[PDB]
Write a protein that binds this DNA or RNA. Sequence first.
DNA 1: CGATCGATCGATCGATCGATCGATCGATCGATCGATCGATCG
Length: 97
Amino acid sequence: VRKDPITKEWTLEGGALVLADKGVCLIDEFDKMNDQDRTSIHEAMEQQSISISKAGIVTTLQARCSIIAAANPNGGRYNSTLPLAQNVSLTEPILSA
DNA sequence: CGATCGATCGATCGATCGATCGATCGATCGATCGATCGATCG
């Protein structure tokens, strides 16, 4: 959110997902971010849009981006005897995306 | 007539394990602070 003296209403400036609209968004070390940060990424791939209600601004922006994510398994080594759904903290609904 | 032996059963030492509990280290959600600026007022 940014101020603007010309019109005096709050103006909104987009983040990384808005930039990558009709592009690719790369998230290295995807597991290490918190779930609140990770929740935004999930709804970004599903809806291809950003929904925000902050500073009195309610609007939606286009976020049509492709995602390439790198991560690491729990303990730094992949457990070959357990499924993927039990090797990372990344929850299953986010894996389905 | 009895002297030798290979098998069986009861009992015990012990080496071990499962269920349960409180205690130790740690992730992390919530509270507070701060820094620049803006809107109202004198």
